Nucleic acid binder design. Structure first.
Lengths: 207, 141, 169, 38
RNA sequence: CGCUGAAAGCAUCUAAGCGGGAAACUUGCCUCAAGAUGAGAUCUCACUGGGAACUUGAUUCCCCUGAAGGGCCGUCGAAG
RNA sequence: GAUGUCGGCUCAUCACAUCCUGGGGCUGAAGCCGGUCCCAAGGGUAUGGCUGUUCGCCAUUUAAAGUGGUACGCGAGCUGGGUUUAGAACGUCGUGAGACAGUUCGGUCCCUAUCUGCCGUGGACGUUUGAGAUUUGAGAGGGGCUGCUCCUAGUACGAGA
RNA sequence: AGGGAAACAACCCAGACCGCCAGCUAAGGUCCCAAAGUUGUGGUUAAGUGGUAAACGAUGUGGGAAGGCUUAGACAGCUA
């Protein structure tokens, strides 16, 4: 179980003893249960949620009927949460209330798309020398493989292209503040993605 | 000219093999024999005149000697260093039907016909199969 | 001579259950001893119990002897309380769990399963009581690897005998 | 243990055992005459 | 490192049968993943008209009808 | 009718005959240390002064600075210091042109990738009427390192240290 | 050339005049890839030996010859 919110940028909190703790603030408009997938009817236990406000003209008839079984009147995206043993009816509303402070949590978003990186930026390679006789290749990868054994490049060779919008989980981030009146998690540190990207906050896998 | 079987008017039957203590490859050789259609006088080597074989208790299949803890199964994942192995008993715990499938697959030809014959083998795990509509009858009782 | 042709000579207080393929031994001071007797084995009856093989193998020749030995210590453990006196350093026996601080910062607590029981007759000693010698010897070995005997000064948990190899530097 | 290609009974208390396909030697007196395969 | 234990009245980790045991191995952690042609599963939505020829998984042709939705296009993006 | 060296850079990949880290046995192993031999390949595994160096010798680190295969991996990825064409000089040999178990200064490194491979990213079709979304996970990849001060305790051990 | 030895001038069998939807064989083979014995009788072998290999080391097991210790009561285990 977890929650779906959007990243509102990073801020800071000073404690009274004087340490500034770096804080990202994950705004969680309250998530609305659409299905409850049971192992009898679906093979596994899970719950679908929704987070608010799509236009009427952007919700298709299949999608509107799915959002009208569950009397939810629902919004951008649909997300899923594998469950162990929890019971949610298909109209319920899970909020930031499933988090306390302290409360180590795992946060996943989509990382910021760097476009088509080179091997220095993508895989932290070394550059060759810039001046000592070096011909045209100052920033290129070096050799790829070995000569005639094997006579081909091994799979998974580190080359260049698209440091992009992959899914990244950042795990064991402490919850600084659960602010349920205006629906906020304040989370210690960095979180993957830009401001306003969708971000999934569920408790820590390494506890 | 001699007879050629032709894939529109080939007769196929459904059969249940109960692998409840059978030797692995001595079961697989009769299964592969019946998937190619070697037991029928209408055997033509370029058309599959075989039968559909259901195998039910495919974790009660049995290897002789010390092949239970031994008999590694290998596969290379494609990446360097990526050779991967599993023995008989951890494969019969993980995916029990994969034993009696890779035995029969290795004894079929390495053809698109061998793929088409392998599609007629339906091995399962427990004592039942989801094929009561095709009505298979038991063989090698 | 060979041991399978040596009969069991069970006392009167061992009321067995002949079942055809597996033996089931009941009695007082412990009971419920079941053993799946193997295929190459004969279990017959008289005033006493006795065993014989079935076929001319060297594999069953070991098996009839071990079946007589298993039912020998099985019967004599249904009759008597199999023991062991493990001598150690510091034993605070309290209940179904055992508590011993063998020279570490933590006192490692050892629990005892069904069957076995351990007592505290002295300050440095443990007497065990059980109905099968299998589990008696197994829990004695499970106590023993908590701290094996150091040779030089001599520390750890021992057996009842003294054949521990001691060295001087 | 002491791994050789030729295990022997070094003293009278040594005893040769085929265990799990390995020719080992157990000594009831001195564990330095324990030796593994041969 | 063993318990019990014979073959081999004993002794023996073993031959049957039971245990402990490492960053190795399989999970656990993260990511991709049904082109997994074995192409899986859920929830929801859409379509509920005639006729002719020839050969009746029936196909082809004409008329009407083109839905759910997808796209082209435009304004763009912390996506490229 | 050409398979272009040694070294360095950049990037590697496997083995295990294991350098560290992990698990053990024996000891002429009291403890801190060790010696040797098994088991283990998961991850790690210096920066420099000199010389063209590989190596080596030093300096200073580290838990450790492993050994090897890969065209002594890798120049259609770079260098071009060494060898190394043409210039010149020294010593030596030769009457000489010239030469060298030799030294010495100087001296052009071409290619826009078709195919396999590899890293990315699409277009087609198929999944059995079609569609919007959400998914299970067969399988695959990544990851996996380690030091120090303290806390029982100056205790167990050791005459003591 | 052909067939066999997986693939393999030189090894084995055999020397292709042409056609055949005829038969019998050689080397090699007869569970399935793949044509033919899941053939018969008697054994051996538990290592996957077969399907890589030396000095030497092993109560691994089958067979065949021989000695003496062999109930006045032997080979390891209890009552001076």
């Amino acid at each position: 179980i977890g929650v779906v919110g959007r990243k509102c940028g990073m801020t800071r909190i000073f404690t009274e003893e004087g340490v500034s703790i770096p804080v990202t603030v994950i705004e969680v408009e309250p998530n609305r249960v659409t299905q409850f997938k049971t192992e009898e009817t679906d093979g596994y236990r899970a719950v679908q949620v929704t987070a608010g406000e799509r236009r009427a003209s952007r919700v298709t008839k299949a999608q509107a009927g799915h959002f009208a079984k569950a009397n939810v009147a629902a919004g951008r995206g649909v997300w899923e949460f594998r469950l162990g043993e929890e019971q949610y009816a298909a109209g319920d509303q899970i909020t930031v209330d499933l988090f306390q402070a302290g409360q180590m949590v795992d946060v996943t978003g989509e990382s910021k798309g760097k476009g088509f990186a080179g091997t220095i930026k993508r895989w932290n390679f070394r550059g060759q020398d810039n001046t000592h006789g070096n011909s045209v290749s100052h920033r290129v990868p070096g050799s790829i493989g070995q000569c005639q054994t094997p006579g081909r490049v091994f799979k998974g060779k580190k080359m260049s292209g698209h440091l992009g919008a992959e899914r990244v989980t950042v795990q064991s981030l402490e919850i600084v503040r659960v602010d349920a009146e205006r629906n906020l998690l304040l989370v210690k540190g960095a979180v993957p993605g830009a401001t306003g990207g969708d971000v999934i906050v569920r408790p820590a896998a390494k506890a | 000219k001699t007879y050629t079987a032709k894939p529109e008017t080939v007769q196929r039957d459904w059969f249940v093999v109960d692998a409840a203590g059978q030797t692995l490859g001595r079961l697989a050789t009769e299964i592969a024999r019946r998937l190619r259609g070697k037991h029928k006088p209408e055997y033509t080597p370029h058309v599959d005149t075989g039968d559909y074989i259901v195998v039910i208790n495919a974790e009660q299949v049995r290897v002789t000697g010390a092949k239970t803890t031994d008999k590694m199964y290998y596969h290379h994942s494609g990446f360097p260093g990526g050779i991967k192995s599993i023995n008989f008993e951890k494969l019969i715990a993980k995916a029990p039907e994969r034993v009696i499938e890779t035995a029969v697959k290795g004894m079929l030809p390495k053809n698109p016909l061998g793929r088409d014959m392998y599609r007629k083998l339906k091995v399962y795990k427990g004592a039942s199969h989801p094929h009561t509509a095709q009505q298979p009858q038991e063989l090698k009782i | 001579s060979r041991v399978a042709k040596n009969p069991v000579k069970l006392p009167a207080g061992v009321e067995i259950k002949l079942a055809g393929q597996q033996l089931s031994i009941k009695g007082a001071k412990g009971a419920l001893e079941l053993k799946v007797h193997p295929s190459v084995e004969v279990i017959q009856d008289s005033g006493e119990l006795r065993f014989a093989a079935r076929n001319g193998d060297q594999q069953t020749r070991a098996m009839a002897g071990t079946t007589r030995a298993l039912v020998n210590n099985m019967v004599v453990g249904v009759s008597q309380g199999f023991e062991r006196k493990l001598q150690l350093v510091g034993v605070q026996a309290k209940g179904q769990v055992l508590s011993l601080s063998l020279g570490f910062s933590h006192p490692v607590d050892y629990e005892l399963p069904a069957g076995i029981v351990a007592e505290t007759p002295s300050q440095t000693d443990i007497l065990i009581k059980g109905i099968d010698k299998q589990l008696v010897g197994q829990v004695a070995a499970e106590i023993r690897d908590f701290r094996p005997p150091e040779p030089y000064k001599g520390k750890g948990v021992r057996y009842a005998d003294e054949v521990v190899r001691r060295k001087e530097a | 243990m002491k791994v050789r290609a030729s295990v022997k009974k070094l003293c009278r208390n040594c005893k040769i055992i085929r265990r799990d396909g390995i020719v080992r030697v157990i000594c009831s007196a001195e564990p330095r005459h324990k030796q593994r395969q041969g």
